[PDB]
RNA sequence: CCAUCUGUGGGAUUAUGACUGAACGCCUCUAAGUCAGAAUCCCGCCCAGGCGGAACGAUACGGCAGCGCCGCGGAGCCUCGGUUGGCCUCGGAUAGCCGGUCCCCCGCCGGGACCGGGGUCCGGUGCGGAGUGCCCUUCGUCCUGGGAAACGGGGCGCGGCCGGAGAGGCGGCCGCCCCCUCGCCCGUCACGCACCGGCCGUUCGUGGGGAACCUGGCGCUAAACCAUUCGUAGACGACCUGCU
RNA sequence: CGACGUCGCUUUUUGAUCCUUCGAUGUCGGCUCUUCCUAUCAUUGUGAAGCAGAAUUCACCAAGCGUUGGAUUGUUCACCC
């Protein structure tokens, strides 16, 4: 695929109602796809992966995102991922910390592609859950709940090619 | 990772004095003054306290191989304190089997002459580091006493003299004759 | 009095990498140093000016050794501020690296 | 060494971005790049902006690891920031520079003549000063 | 293939713009490093090779086989009529080496030296420095000389004295004097410059310049032997004496 | 006038590229203090990458073979030639508008030196990496003028400090004169801060 | 080598052995920061000397000529690039800039008195205003009034005190002498409908670069090649030579 | 040192193939000459060893400098003083 900024769609589908039984049950999935067409297709991927249904024998009853509950509350997510690694499938439990669940998942994809160089076509998310400070576990996240935090901007540098290429002074890299 | 902060603090004895212009730390006490300018260590050296109780090294946003440096700088300035307040002394005993090592100090403070090594007629003039006083002692039969303030300096000179007297194309498991650093020490003791 | 034309550096030609078009010159206007600053110059008349052995005639004056190749800026080009301009004759290519006067004749302020 | 830390209540100038030129208080740090901010009396939505768009000042407030804008407004007006800031020199530089950048043409003709006269006056008195320095010099 | 046997390369590639030397006099390309740890003294000096001859001395090498015994050695008689010194040149240093700052010639210079500026003594008026001379006789010239020596004392930091030999004392056909700089090692440039100033226009002996039983170096243009073949020039074995078009 | 760039503190490529572009556009760029130009990377790796160039001669010849250059000036000049065209008349007439120098000559000594902060080391490189000076590189692989250039430049510096000192005194005198005659310029002190200057 | 002589000195480090010291309260040659290190490597010595430079000499009696230095005058050619200037501290980045003293002593009568630079104090600033987003110059000719002005301004005026070196351009001031006290900001009469009737190459670097020609003052009176000789050189050239 | 296993490298062997020349590239070996490579026989500096010394073996940085005189065959190859 080609991730932009993931938006957390929700899809509900079923097999077509055969004459044998008036209607089969209805299935709900929470799927991260940059647009709802890809949401539909990946829903079919998951469904055919789990139970013997295909879009040929199914219709997508509902397809739309879930707007974020309280997108102004900083929340730290634990994310249960399962990927493939050029030598065999690996389960894995990563962790992130952001505002919107979609933001957390997009961070997960970006940092899996970087820190573990597995493309976005081999990652299938199981769970993403906002969890409390007593269940967060990796230290990198853990160091960001302090009632008071202070840290300077250590070595700060910014752009000066639009500001002139040829200036007569030199930049200050303190404040 | 990039740990947000790491710190270390040294409680300075009052009988010493420390000045700083940026990373350059200068320590002046009873036995003299020392300088050391820590460029490319990239830390925050701060001095706090009435009678300058404590010094604080702080490393911001460091990685693992970079938090490693904080306690290194701690130990460096600690040994600087040890030198300025006490002074470092090293002691050398020269093992010999059939050729008694003849070491004399050709000039007073440095320039150690070494001869009669294994039968070698080759004299050596090992040049002690500047700011280091060599002194053959006398209460121990074969004893070199190296003294200074910068443990870097005294120990460097020490290993230099030890390594300059070694065999070539011989078994070092039986042939052993030579000088060696033996018992690392200071000048005066608590 | 004084000058009334912005300076310009004739800098190249619209070219892919191995095909060069001579009907669309590229200028770099000293003063504009990023796109979204062209919006003042678009459509400003611009001239190439130089000298030669034989004389010419000069409007409102006696003959002088100066000649001019007229033209105008047409559209913006690139994120850096380069501009495309078309002249009433393909530029003589001796001047890639020389000066162009970009005046203020059509002034849409 | 550093004399402007980033605290739970730091008050920061924005320098880049679409809110540029404004002032806004940090609320809480998300990570090492982005920190939720807002200024209710400075007309900015509560929204997570990077540090690279930020710029730091000396004004520090009091509120927790997350608060309501209702309460941060009272915290803001407690200090009455929009006077202390507008008194700081760092605002005078800004304001005078946009005064220049909006200084029109006829204003330029006033300024050229006035500054020219000032410079002649300055060189007048300065020349008197060189005359005076030598006579007492050694 | 690989060369089936290994033999040293013939000749030496470290002398290999091998050609006629444009100079006719050994052109010193170096000098002993300057040092103020000595009072000044010159360092180069011109002689002529007349021929060898024997010598007998009792050798002194202690402990060797021939010690304290007589041997004979073959010496080469270079004779050197005393030179005159006629000019002083200053050098300065720039990031690109040295630069010939300035020169000052003597008041009067002998015809042997004037003969080095010309090609047809017979066809010429021998008119060199005929104007320069008055910069010694007019006070204004003396003031300019003062300016020159002040500059050469301040900025310059290598000083050399122009000297030449005088053919008149010599049984060679030639009458054109051979001119060379000599670099003055010794104390500060002040001492060097003022001393050479005082030594302008006087005979220069030999025993002053060179010590006794010393160890010197000889620089000259070797004997010439015409456009020469390729078994004598680089010493390459002659092919067996039955080859074709060459051997 | 003509552009002049301090060479101290800049990187090699990050300065070569901009200088080449400017030259080929037409500015008569001059580079000075071309001996204190930095290189990104430790010293022995770069010395290896220089010897690996210095072996690129022929069998013996200079004809069939490249002309190395060992002074910092002409190493910079070589890199700029690399980023220019140098087999076409435009490229030659370009490369003959750049001029390098070591340290600083007099005609530019009493002249301002801008910089190119797109190339400065502090800007364009981390704190924890290693860099190697072009002065030391050249002096290792043969450049017989380290002492000479150092001494000449440090003599300039003592020449220039007194200029800077008199500049300080003159700026102070300007301050004093303004404060001493500012009973008649307040009208003028108005129409400056009115349109937004001096503050 | 069938006889004789002569054949050289440094720097940076690699292998490797170590100093200090964490990483990991210990340990550690290493991760920051150091040392010793060699037929290797780089330079020095020796060979040549670049559409690469330097210093210096002499620089044309048909004075009845060819030329140079000054101050302009006079055309004609052709080459074609711009279209105000910036005169300058080091440098630091996990820091600087700038002020003045209480203070530290240091070289020029320092120390016996005037003199800054050097340190150490403490104060104002810092997303740098003592800021290149910067600074200076900066805008048709004319009468009279207000403010700075008179310690002024100008003189290819004299001269001086003096200076300037990595490629001396150029620098101030001053003894004078002469000339105006007007030229700068704000106002008052105006003056060639300035001329262009709406309209392009005119609006300054400019007295620009190079060849070739007709004016006044002060100064120059040469060498090169051939021919010839020599043999310390030579295939022929080239080289070393002599020639009232 | 290294078996039973196994992964490579090199093109200093011999094969396999037919792409280039049949209106032509002169095809063995030797002699002379330059230069290059390193997987180092000797030498400079080093570690290791069942290393006391003396020799010798393994390994590291390393091609700057050496690597011969002859009987027999045309010999490359070999063999011997």
TrEMBL record, chain F:
Gene Ontology biological process: negative regulation of translation; translation
Protein family per UniProt: Belongs to the universal ribosomal protein uL13 family.
Q: How does it assemble?
A: Component of the 60S ribosome. Component of the GAIT complex. Interacts with EIF4G1.
**Keywords assigned by UniProt, alphabetized:** Citrullination, Ribonucleoprotein, Ribosomal protein, Translation regulation
Q: Under what name is this protein listed?
A: Large ribosomal subunit protein uL13
Molecular function via GO: mRNA binding; structural constituent of ribosome
Checking InterPro entries in the record gives:
Ribosomal_uL13, Ribosomal_uL13_CS, Ribosomal_uL13_euk/arc, Ribosomal_uL13_sf
Question: Which segment of the chain is annotated as a signal peptide?
Answer: none
* UniProt function note: Associated with ribosomes but is not required for canonical ribosome function and has extra-ribosomal functions. Component of the GAIT (gamma interferon-activated inhibitor of translation) complex which mediates interferon-gamma-induced transcript-selective translation inhibition in inflammation processes. Upon interferon-gamma activation and subsequent phosphorylation dissociates from the ribosome and assembles into the GAIT complex which binds to stem loop-containing GAIT elements in the 3'-UTR of diverse inflammatory mRNAs (such as ceruplasmin) and suppresses their translation.
Q: Which NCBIfam families match?
A: L13_A_E (TIGR01077)
HAMAP family xrefs: Ribosomal_uL13
Query: Does Cell inner membrane appear among the keywords?
Result: no
A cellular component annotation (GO) from this entry: cytosolic large ribosomal subunit
**Listed Pfam families:** Ribosomal_L13
